[PDB]
Short mmCIF file of all heavy atoms in Angstrom, two decimals:
data_model
loop_
_atom_site.label_atom_id
_atom_site.label_comp_id
_atom_site.label_asym_id
_atom_site.label_seq_id
_atom_site.Cartn_x
_atom_site.Cartn_y
_atom_site.Cartn_z
N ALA T 192 32.04 27.44 21.60
CA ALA T 192 33.24 27.34 22.50
C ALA T 192 33.25 28.36 23.57
O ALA T 192 33.52 28.13 24.72
CB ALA T 192 34.56 27.63 21.56
N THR T 193 32.73 29.58 23.30
CA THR T 193 32.68 30.63 24.29
C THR T 193 31.53 30.18 25.41
O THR T 193 31.77 30.46 26.57
CB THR T 193 32.19 31.87 23.81
OG1 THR T 193 30.88 31.80 22.96
CG2 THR T 193 33.23 32.48 22.98
N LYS T 194 30.49 29.45 24.88
CA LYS T 194 29.49 29.06 25.81
C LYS T 194 30.17 28.05 26.78
O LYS T 194 29.90 28.05 28.14
CB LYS T 194 28.29 28.41 25.18
CG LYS T 194 27.42 27.57 26.01
CD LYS T 194 26.24 26.97 25.26
CE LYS T 194 25.19 26.26 26.08
NZ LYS T 194 24.08 25.76 25.25
N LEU T 195 30.98 27.18 26.31
CA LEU T 195 31.50 26.06 27.09
C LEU T 195 32.76 26.57 27.96
O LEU T 195 33.07 26.02 29.05
CB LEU T 195 32.02 24.94 26.28
CG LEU T 195 30.91 24.22 25.56
CD1 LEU T 195 31.75 23.23 24.49
CD2 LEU T 195 30.03 23.42 26.35
N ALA T 196 33.36 27.71 27.47
CA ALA T 196 34.51 28.25 28.20
C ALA T 196 33.97 28.78 29.63
O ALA T 196 34.75 28.65 30.59
CB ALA T 196 35.06 29.44 27.35
N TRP T 197 32.83 29.36 29.59
CA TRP T 197 32.34 30.06 30.91
C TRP T 197 31.91 28.91 31.83
O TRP T 197 32.04 29.06 33.05
CB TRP T 197 31.29 31.09 30.60
CG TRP T 197 31.80 32.28 29.86
CD1 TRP T 197 31.51 32.63 28.71
CD2 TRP T 197 32.70 33.22 30.49
NE1 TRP T 197 32.09 33.91 28.35
CE2 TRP T 197 32.84 34.21 29.45
CE3 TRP T 197 33.35 33.40 31.75
CZ2 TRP T 197 33.73 35.30 29.68
CZ3 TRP T 197 34.08 34.43 31.88
CH2 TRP T 197 34.33 35.44 30.89
N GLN T 198 31.23 27.91 31.28
CA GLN T 198 30.62 26.88 32.18
C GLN T 198 31.73 26.04 32.71
O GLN T 198 31.39 25.14 33.62
CB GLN T 198 29.75 26.12 31.38
CG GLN T 198 28.38 26.74 30.94
CD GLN T 198 27.32 25.92 30.49
OE1 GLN T 198 27.47 24.60 30.50
NE2 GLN T 198 26.14 26.45 30.14
N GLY T 199 33.01 26.15 32.25
CA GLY T 199 34.10 25.21 32.83
C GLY T 199 34.50 25.59 34.26
O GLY T 199 35.26 24.92 34.87
N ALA T 200 34.09 26.87 34.76
CA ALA T 200 34.51 27.13 36.13
C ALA T 200 34.12 26.27 37.22
O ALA T 200 34.74 26.09 38.21
CB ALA T 200 34.03 28.59 36.36
N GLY T 201 33.13 25.49 36.92
CA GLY T 201 32.56 24.64 37.76
C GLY T 201 32.93 23.03 37.46
O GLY T 201 32.39 22.15 37.87
N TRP T 202 34.08 22.93 36.74
CA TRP T 202 34.56 21.65 36.27
C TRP T 202 34.65 20.66 37.40
O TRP T 202 34.26 19.57 37.29
CB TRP T 202 35.71 21.74 35.26
CG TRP T 202 37.01 21.92 36.03
CD1 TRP T 202 37.60 23.10 36.35
CD2 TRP T 202 37.88 20.80 36.69
NE1 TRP T 202 38.78 22.70 36.97
CE2 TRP T 202 38.99 21.44 37.30
CE3 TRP T 202 37.69 19.50 36.81
CZ2 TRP T 202 39.96 20.69 37.91
CZ3 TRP T 202 38.76 18.68 37.29
CH2 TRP T 202 39.70 19.38 38.02
N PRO T 203 35.30 21.00 38.57
CA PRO T 203 35.52 19.98 39.58
C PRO T 203 34.31 19.35 40.09
O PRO T 203 34.14 18.08 40.42
CB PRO T 203 36.30 20.70 40.60
CG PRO T 203 36.65 22.05 40.13
CD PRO T 203 35.62 22.26 39.07
N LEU T 204 33.17 20.06 40.15
CA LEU T 204 31.88 19.56 40.57
C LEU T 204 31.36 18.76 39.47
O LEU T 204 30.84 17.61 39.63
CB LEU T 204 30.93 20.63 40.82
CG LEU T 204 31.29 21.67 42.12
CD1 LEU T 204 30.53 22.90 42.05
CD2 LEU T 204 31.12 20.92 43.34
N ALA T 205 31.39 19.21 38.25
CA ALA T 205 30.79 18.44 37.16
C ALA T 205 31.65 17.15 36.96
O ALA T 205 31.13 16.11 36.56
CB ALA T 205 30.64 19.35 35.92
N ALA T 206 33.02 17.31 37.05
CA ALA T 206 33.84 16.17 36.71
C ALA T 206 33.50 14.99 37.69
O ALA T 206 33.54 13.92 37.35
CB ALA T 206 35.24 16.63 36.85
N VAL T 207 33.31 15.39 39.12
CA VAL T 207 33.12 14.41 40.10
C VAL T 207 31.72 13.63 39.81
O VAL T 207 31.59 12.46 39.97
CB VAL T 207 33.19 15.07 41.45
CG1 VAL T 207 32.67 13.95 42.50
CG2 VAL T 207 34.61 15.29 41.77
N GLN T 208 30.73 14.57 39.57
CA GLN T 208 29.42 13.87 39.35
C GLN T 208 29.31 12.95 38.11
O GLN T 208 28.66 11.90 38.13
CB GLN T 208 28.35 14.89 39.16
CG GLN T 208 28.20 15.83 40.34
CD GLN T 208 27.75 15.12 41.60
OE1 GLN T 208 27.30 13.96 41.54
NE2 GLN T 208 27.65 15.70 42.86
N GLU T 209 30.06 13.20 37.09
CA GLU T 209 30.25 12.28 36.04
C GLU T 209 30.78 10.98 36.41
O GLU T 209 30.48 9.85 36.00
CB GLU T 209 30.95 12.82 34.83
CG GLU T 209 30.21 13.95 34.07
CD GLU T 209 30.94 14.30 32.73
OE1 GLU T 209 31.44 13.39 32.08
OE2 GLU T 209 31.04 15.55 32.52
N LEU T 210 31.81 11.07 37.30
CA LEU T 210 32.54 9.74 37.84
C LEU T 210 31.59 8.90 38.56
O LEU T 210 31.63 7.75 38.43
CB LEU T 210 33.75 10.27 38.76
CG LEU T 210 34.52 9.07 39.35
CD1 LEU T 210 34.92 8.11 38.35
CD2 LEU T 210 35.75 9.61 40.06
N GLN T 211 30.89 9.56 39.39
CA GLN T 211 29.88 8.72 40.32
C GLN T 211 28.77 8.18 39.57
O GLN T 211 28.25 7.07 39.94
CB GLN T 211 29.39 9.56 41.39
CG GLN T 211 30.37 10.00 42.46
CD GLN T 211 30.05 10.97 43.39
OE1 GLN T 211 29.15 11.79 43.20
NE2 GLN T 211 30.73 11.08 44.66
N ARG T 212 28.30 8.84 38.50
CA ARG T 212 27.26 8.35 37.64
C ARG T 212 27.76 7.40 36.58
O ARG T 212 26.86 6.70 35.92
CB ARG T 212 26.53 9.47 37.03
CG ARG T 212 24.93 9.46 37.15
CD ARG T 212 24.64 9.52 38.68
NE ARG T 212 25.20 10.67 39.13
CZ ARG T 212 25.31 10.91 40.52
NH1 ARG T 212 25.21 9.90 41.32
NH2 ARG T 212 25.70 12.20 40.95
N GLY T 213 28.96 7.22 36.53
CA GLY T 213 29.54 6.12 35.57
C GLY T 213 29.56 6.52 34.10
O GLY T 213 29.73 5.62 33.24
N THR T 214 29.36 7.77 33.79
CA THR T 214 29.41 8.20 32.45
C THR T 214 30.79 8.97 31.99
O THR T 214 30.90 9.37 30.88
CB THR T 214 28.20 9.21 32.06
OG1 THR T 214 28.45 10.35 32.91
CG2 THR T 214 26.86 8.52 32.48
N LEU T 215 31.70 8.80 32.85
CA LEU T 215 32.99 9.32 32.65
C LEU T 215 33.83 8.51 31.68
O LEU T 215 34.44 8.95 30.80
CB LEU T 215 33.77 9.69 33.89
CG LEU T 215 35.16 10.39 33.71
CD1 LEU T 215 34.96 11.84 33.07
CD2 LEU T 215 35.83 10.40 34.93
N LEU T 216 33.72 7.23 31.83
CA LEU T 216 34.52 6.32 31.10
C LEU T 216 33.84 5.49 30.17
O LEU T 216 32.60 5.10 30.32
CB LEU T 216 35.32 5.29 32.01
CG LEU T 216 36.22 6.01 33.09
CD1 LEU T 216 36.76 4.78 34.08
CD2 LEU T 216 37.13 6.83 32.55
N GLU T 217 34.41 5.21 29.00
CA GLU T 217 33.83 4.23 28.05
C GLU T 217 33.79 2.90 28.54
O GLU T 217 34.57 2.46 29.35
CB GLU T 217 34.56 4.41 26.64
CG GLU T 217 33.74 5.21 25.61
CD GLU T 217 32.63 4.57 25.17
OE1 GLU T 217 32.28 3.45 25.40
OE2 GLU T 217 31.79 5.32 24.45
N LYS T 218 32.87 2.03 27.98
CA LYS T 218 32.98 0.60 28.30
C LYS T 218 34.06 -0.05 27.50
O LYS T 218 34.44 0.20 26.40
CB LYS T 218 31.62 -0.07 27.84
CG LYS T 218 30.29 0.59 28.44
CD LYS T 218 29.03 -0.07 28.01
CE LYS T 218 27.76 0.53 28.58
NZ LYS T 218 26.61 -0.04 28.03
N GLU T 219 34.62 -1.10 28.23
CA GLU T 219 35.80 -1.87 27.58
C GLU T 219 35.34 -2.54 26.30
O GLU T 219 36.25 -2.73 25.35
CB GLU T 219 36.12 -2.89 28.65
CG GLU T 219 37.28 -3.88 27.98
CD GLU T 219 37.83 -4.86 29.01
OE1 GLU T 219 37.70 -4.50 30.21
OE2 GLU T 219 38.31 -5.91 28.70
N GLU T 220 34.08 -2.79 26.04
CA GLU T 220 33.63 -3.46 24.88
C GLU T 220 33.51 -2.63 23.69
O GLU T 220 33.30 -3.01 22.52
CB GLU T 220 32.38 -4.17 25.09
CG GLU T 220 31.11 -3.23 25.66
CD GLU T 220 29.91 -4.17 25.68
OE1 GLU T 220 29.86 -5.27 25.65
OE2 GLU T 220 28.87 -3.42 25.94
N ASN T 221 33.44 -1.24 23.95
CA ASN T 221 33.25 -0.13 22.93
C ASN T 221 34.64 0.34 22.42
O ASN T 221 34.58 1.43 21.74
CB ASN T 221 32.33 0.87 23.30
CG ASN T 221 30.91 0.34 23.59
OD1 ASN T 221 30.50 -0.77 23.16
ND2 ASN T 221 30.07 1.12 24.41
N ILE T 222 35.82 -0.19 22.85
CA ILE T 222 37.04 0.47 22.65
C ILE T 222 37.74 -0.71 21.77
O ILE T 222 37.85 -1.80 22.10
CB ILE T 222 37.83 0.79 23.77
CG1 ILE T 222 37.04 1.72 24.80
CG2 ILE T 222 39.11 1.42 23.48
CD1 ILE T 222 37.62 2.14 26.05
N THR T 223 38.30 -0.25 20.72
CA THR T 223 39.08 -1.14 19.76
C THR T 223 40.41 -1.38 20.42
O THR T 223 41.06 -0.49 20.91
CB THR T 223 39.20 -0.49 18.37
OG1 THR T 223 39.69 -1.53 17.52
CG2 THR T 223 40.11 0.64 18.42
N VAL T 224 40.91 -2.57 20.24
CA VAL T 224 42.21 -3.06 20.65
C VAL T 224 42.71 -4.15 19.71
O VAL T 224 41.92 -4.70 18.90
CB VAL T 224 42.08 -3.69 22.09
CG1 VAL T 224 41.74 -2.57 23.11
CG2 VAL T 224 41.21 -4.96 22.16
N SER T 225 44.13 -4.18 19.63
CA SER T 225 44.88 -5.05 18.79
C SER T 225 44.75 -6.50 19.19
O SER T 225 44.37 -6.83 20.35
CB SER T 225 46.35 -4.57 18.68
OG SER T 225 46.95 -4.73 19.90
N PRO T 226 45.01 -7.33 18.26
CA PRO T 226 45.00 -8.80 18.60
C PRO T 226 46.03 -9.19 19.70
O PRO T 226 47.13 -8.49 19.79
CB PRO T 226 45.48 -9.51 17.32
CG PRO T 226 45.15 -8.47 16.24
CD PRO T 226 45.25 -7.08 16.87
#
Side-chain angles (χ1 to χ4, degrees):
Chain T
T193 55
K194 170 180 180 177
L195 300 171
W197 293 111
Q198 294 194 359
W202 78 263
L204 297 164
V207 168
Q208 295 299 349
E209 285 189 45
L210 174 54
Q211 287 166 340
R212 232 62 58 205
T214 63
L215 184 62
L216 305 179
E217 260 289 348
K218 300 179 182 177
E219 175 175 336
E220 58 172 15
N221 298 337
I222 306 175
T223 189
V224 293
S225 61

